[PDB]
Amino acid sequence: HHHFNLPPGNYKKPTLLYCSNGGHFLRILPDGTVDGTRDRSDQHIQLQLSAESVGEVYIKSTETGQYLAMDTDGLLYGSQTPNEECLFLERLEENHYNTYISKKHAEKNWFVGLKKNGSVKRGPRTHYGQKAILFLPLPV
Numbered sequence: 001h002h003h004f005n006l007p008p009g010n011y012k013k014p015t016l017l018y019c020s021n022g023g024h025f026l027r028i029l030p031d032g033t034v035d036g037t038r039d040r041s042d043q044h045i046q047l048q049l050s051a052e053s054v055g056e057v058y059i060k061s062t063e064t065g066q067y068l069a070m071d072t073d074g075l076l077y078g079s080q081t082p083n084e085e086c087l088f089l090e091r092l093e094e095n096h097y098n099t100y101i102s103k104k105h106a107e108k109n110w111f112v113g114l115k116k117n118g119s120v121k122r123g124p125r126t127h128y129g130q131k132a133i134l135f136l137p138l139p140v
Helices: none
Strands: 016-019 024-028 034-037 047-053 056-061 067-070 076-079 088-093 097-102 135-138
Touching (some): 034 076
Antiparallel strands (some): 016 024, 016 135, 024 034, 056 088, 067 076, 088 097
Protein backbone atom coordinates (compact mmCIF):
# COMPACT_ATOMS: atom_id res chain seq x y z
CA HIS A 1 0.00 0.00 0.00
CA HIS A 2 2.77 2.45 0.89
CA HIS A 3 6.53 2.98 0.61
CA PHE A 4 8.84 1.96 3.42
CA ASN A 5 11.34 4.83 3.77
CA LEU A 6 11.62 5.16 7.58
CA PRO A 7 12.85 8.16 9.61
CA PRO A 8 16.15 7.66 11.47
CA GLY A 9 15.01 8.55 14.93
CA ASN A 10 14.27 6.18 17.79
CA TYR A 11 11.69 6.07 20.62
CA LYS A 12 14.05 5.95 23.57
CA LYS A 13 12.76 9.28 24.80
CA PRO A 14 9.60 11.42 24.66
CA THR A 15 9.18 13.95 21.89
CA LEU A 16 7.23 16.94 20.63
CA LEU A 17 5.77 16.70 17.10
CA TYR A 18 6.19 20.05 15.35
CA CYS A 19 4.23 20.78 12.19
CA SER A 20 5.96 23.16 9.79
CA ASN A 21 2.69 24.18 8.19
CA GLY A 22 1.64 26.76 10.79
CA GLY A 23 4.41 26.06 13.29
CA HIS A 24 2.29 24.19 15.83
CA PHE A 25 3.10 21.31 18.24
CA LEU A 26 0.54 18.48 18.16
CA ARG A 27 -1.51 18.51 21.37
CA ILE A 28 -3.86 15.97 23.00
CA LEU A 29 -6.01 17.70 25.65
CA PRO A 30 -7.34 15.92 28.78
CA ASP A 31 -10.87 15.94 27.40
CA GLY A 32 -9.84 14.01 24.30
CA THR A 33 -9.65 16.97 21.87
CA VAL A 34 -6.65 17.06 19.49
CA ASP A 35 -5.24 20.30 18.04
CA GLY A 36 -1.99 22.17 17.79
CA THR A 37 -0.47 24.99 19.87
CA ARG A 38 2.54 27.28 19.48
CA ASP A 39 3.11 27.31 23.22
CA ARG A 40 6.17 25.18 23.88
CA SER A 41 5.44 25.28 27.60
CA ASP A 42 2.10 23.43 27.21
CA GLN A 43 1.98 20.21 29.25
CA HIS A 44 -0.12 18.40 26.66
CA ILE A 45 2.29 18.44 23.74
CA GLN A 46 4.76 15.93 25.30
CA LEU A 47 4.28 12.60 23.50
CA GLN A 48 5.83 9.14 23.66
CA LEU A 49 6.05 6.98 20.59
CA SER A 50 6.41 3.22 20.74
CA ALA A 51 6.75 0.66 17.98
CA GLU A 52 4.25 -2.18 17.73
CA SER A 53 5.90 -3.45 14.56
CA VAL A 54 8.62 -1.93 12.46
CA GLY A 55 7.26 1.32 11.07
CA GLU A 56 3.98 1.13 13.02
CA VAL A 57 3.56 3.33 16.09
CA TYR A 58 1.35 4.43 18.90
CA ILE A 59 1.60 8.09 19.82
CA LYS A 60 0.67 8.77 23.39
CA SER A 61 0.25 11.68 25.73
CA THR A 62 2.79 11.46 28.52
CA GLU A 63 0.72 13.76 30.72
CA THR A 64 -2.61 11.91 30.37
CA GLY A 65 -1.87 8.42 29.07
CA GLN A 66 -4.20 8.94 26.08
CA TYR A 67 -3.48 7.50 22.64
CA LEU A 68 -3.75 9.54 19.43
CA ALA A 69 -6.41 7.89 17.29
CA MET A 70 -8.23 8.67 14.02
CA ASP A 71 -11.93 7.79 13.85
CA THR A 72 -14.12 6.45 11.09
CA ASP A 73 -14.83 9.88 9.64
CA GLY A 74 -11.19 10.89 9.83
CA LEU A 75 -11.18 13.02 13.00
CA LEU A 76 -8.39 12.73 15.53
CA TYR A 77 -9.24 12.04 19.16
CA GLY A 78 -7.53 10.97 22.41
CA SER A 79 -8.37 7.31 23.22
CA GLN A 80 -8.14 5.96 26.78
CA THR A 81 -7.21 2.48 25.52
CA PRO A 82 -5.19 1.23 22.53
CA ASN A 83 -7.36 0.12 19.61
CA GLU A 84 -7.04 -0.32 15.80
CA GLU A 85 -7.59 3.38 15.31
CA CYS A 86 -4.45 4.22 17.30
CA LEU A 87 -1.85 2.64 14.99
CA PHE A 88 0.00 4.85 12.54
CA LEU A 89 2.49 4.12 9.77
CA GLU A 90 5.45 6.40 10.54
CA ARG A 91 7.38 7.25 7.39
CA LEU A 92 10.05 9.65 6.13
CA GLU A 93 8.80 12.33 3.66
CA GLU A 94 10.75 14.67 1.40
CA ASN A 95 13.89 12.91 2.72
CA HIS A 96 13.51 14.74 6.03
CA TYR A 97 10.13 14.96 7.76
CA ASN A 98 8.05 12.35 9.60
CA THR A 99 4.48 11.64 8.38
CA TYR A 100 1.87 9.52 10.11
CA ILE A 101 -0.64 7.56 8.09
CA SER A 102 -3.67 5.96 9.71
CA LYS A 103 -3.07 2.22 9.52
CA LYS A 104 -6.81 1.46 9.59
CA HIS A 105 -7.38 3.92 6.69
CA ALA A 106 -4.04 3.46 4.94
CA GLU A 107 -5.66 2.59 1.60
CA LYS A 108 -7.26 6.06 1.58
CA ASN A 109 -4.05 7.91 2.47
CA TRP A 110 -5.50 9.56 5.62
CA PHE A 111 -2.72 11.35 7.54
CA VAL A 112 -2.25 13.07 10.81
CA GLY A 113 -2.12 16.79 9.86
CA LEU A 114 -2.39 20.32 11.27
CA LYS A 115 -3.77 23.28 9.31
CA LYS A 116 -2.12 26.69 9.38
CA ASN A 117 -4.58 27.86 12.04
CA GLY A 118 -3.76 24.99 14.36
CA SER A 119 -6.85 22.88 13.87
CA VAL A 120 -6.53 19.20 12.86
CA LYS A 121 -7.11 18.47 9.15
CA ARG A 122 -9.72 15.67 8.65
CA GLY A 123 -8.40 12.43 7.14
CA PRO A 124 -10.01 12.63 3.70
CA ARG A 125 -8.80 16.29 3.38
CA THR A 126 -5.15 15.24 3.79
CA HIS A 127 -2.88 13.93 1.03
CA TYR A 128 0.72 13.59 -0.09
CA GLY A 129 2.08 17.01 -1.11
CA GLN A 130 0.68 19.09 1.72
CA LYS A 131 2.63 20.88 4.37
CA ALA A 132 -0.13 19.99 6.93
CA ILE A 133 1.18 16.42 7.07
CA LEU A 134 4.87 17.19 7.67
CA PHE A 135 6.19 16.84 11.20
CA LEU A 136 9.57 17.21 12.81
CA PRO A 137 10.15 15.39 16.08
CA LEU A 138 11.79 17.72 18.66
CA PRO A 139 13.26 17.02 22.11
CA VAL A 140 11.27 18.00 25.18
